[PDB]
C-alpha cells in the first residue's frame, strides 16, 4: 500500500510471497489452531530443507513446482480479512471518505459553525502554498537527467521544508471517518 | 530488504505531518456552534396514540363509510359460514339440523 511496487519481484520476494500465501491457505484449510500450527511447522520445515539451494536454476524450478502444487492444493474459498480486497467490509466507507476540498465550497454559515477548525484549515492551506513551490524546486533538482526512474519520492533534505507531494498523503480521508 | 534511507526518512516526516493533521481534526468544546416528560406509558405512548393513530382513524373511517359504502361495489365480502342450528338475524329462520350420524365409533 504505502510502498510503490518495483519493476520486478526478486526470487527471494517471490519465495516469501509464496510462503505467506501458502500459510494463509493452510490456515484456511486447517481452521483449528493446533492443526494449523502443526501443518505450518511442517511447511516451514519444507521451505527450510529447500532453503540452501545453490544452483538457483534448481531454485527457480522448485519455485515453479511449488506454485503448481499450491495452485492444485489451494482453498477454493480462502480466508480474506474484512478490510483487505475481496473482503466483506473492503471499500465500505468510501461512500463516507469525503475529500477535503468541499470545505472550500461550504457556505459561510456552515463555516461559522466551525470557526477554529477552519482557522487551522487556512493555516494548513498557506503552509501548502509556500511548500508547493519549494517542493517543485526540490523535485526538479532531484530528477536524474536520464536512466532508470522509480515511483519512490525524496524526503525534505533541509530544515523548515516538507517532503515533496505531501498533501494527498497527509490530508487523505480517515479510514473510519464516521 | 528493509526501508532505504531515502524512504525511511520520508515516511518519518510524512507520518509526523499526518499526526498534526489528525490532531487538527479534533473539535473545540464549543463545537459545533449551534445558533413534561412524565413516563413512557402516560405521555410518550399516549400522545403518539391520540395523534398518529386516533387522528388518522377518523379521516380513514370517514372515507370508509361516507365515501366507500356510497359507491356500489366498493366493499364486497364473502358470505358468512352458515351451519345447521344457526339462526339468521336478517331473515329470522332456522336451518334444520343434520342427519342421525350412524357412525360414532370415535
Amino acid at each position: 500500500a504505502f510502498c510503490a511496487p518495483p519493476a520486478y519481484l526478486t526470487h527471494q520476494q517471490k519465495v516469501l510471497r509464496l510462503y505467506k500465501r501458502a500459510l494463509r491457505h493452510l490456515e484456511s484449510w486447517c481452521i483449528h489452531r493446533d492443526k494449523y500450527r502443526y501443518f505450518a511447522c511442517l511447511m516451514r520445515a519444507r521451505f527450510e530443507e529447500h532453503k540452501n539451494e545453490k544452483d538457483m536454476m534448481r531454485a527457480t524450478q522448485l519455485l515453479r513446482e511449488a506454485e503448481e502444487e499450491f495452485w492444485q492444493n489451494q482453498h477454493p474459498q480462502p480466508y480474506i480479512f474484512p478490510d483487505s480486497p475481496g473482503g466483506t467490509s473492503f471499500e465500505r466507507y468510501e461512500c463516507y471518505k469525503v475529500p477535503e476540498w468541499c470545505l472550500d465550497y461550504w457556505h459561510p454559515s456552515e463555516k461559522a459553525m466551525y470557526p477554529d477548525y477552519f482557522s487551522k484549515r487556512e493555516q494548513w492551506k498557506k503552509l501548502r502554498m509556500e511548500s508547493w513551490d519549494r517542493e517543485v524546486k526540490q523535485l526538479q533538482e532531484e530528477t536524474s537527467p536520464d536512466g532508470i526512474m522509480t515511483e519512490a519520492l525524496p524526503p525534505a533534505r533541509r530544515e523548515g521544508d516538507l517532503p515533496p507531494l505531501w498533501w494527498h498523503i497527509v490530508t487523505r480521508p480517515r479510514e473510519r471517518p464516521t | 530488504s528493509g526501508y532505504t534511507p531515502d524512504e525511511k526518512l520520508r515516511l518519518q516526516q510524512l507520518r509526523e505531518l499526518r499526526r498534526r493533521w489528525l490532531k487538527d481534526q479534533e473539535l473545540s468544546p464549543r463545537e459545533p456552534v449551534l445558533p413534561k416528560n412524565m413516563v413512557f406509558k402516560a405521555y410518550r405512548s399516549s400522545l403518539f396514540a391520540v395523534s398518529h393513530v386516533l387522528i388518522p382513524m377518523w379521516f380513514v373511517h370517514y372515507y370508509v363509510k361516507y365515501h366507500m359504502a356510497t359507491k356500489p361495489y366498493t366493499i364486497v365480502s364473502s358470505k358468512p359460514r352458515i351451519f345447521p342450528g344457526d339462526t339468521i338475524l336478517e331473515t329470522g329462520e332456522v336451518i334444520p339440523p343434520m342427519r342421525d350420524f350412524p357412525d360414532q365409533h370415535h
Partner: peptide
C-alpha cells in the same frame, strides 16, 4: 468522548 470533525459536502444549497 474525543469527537472528530467529519467532512461533508455543501448540503446548504
Amino acid at each position: 468522548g474525543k469527537r472528530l470533525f467529519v467532512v461533508k459536502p455543501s448540503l446548504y444549497y
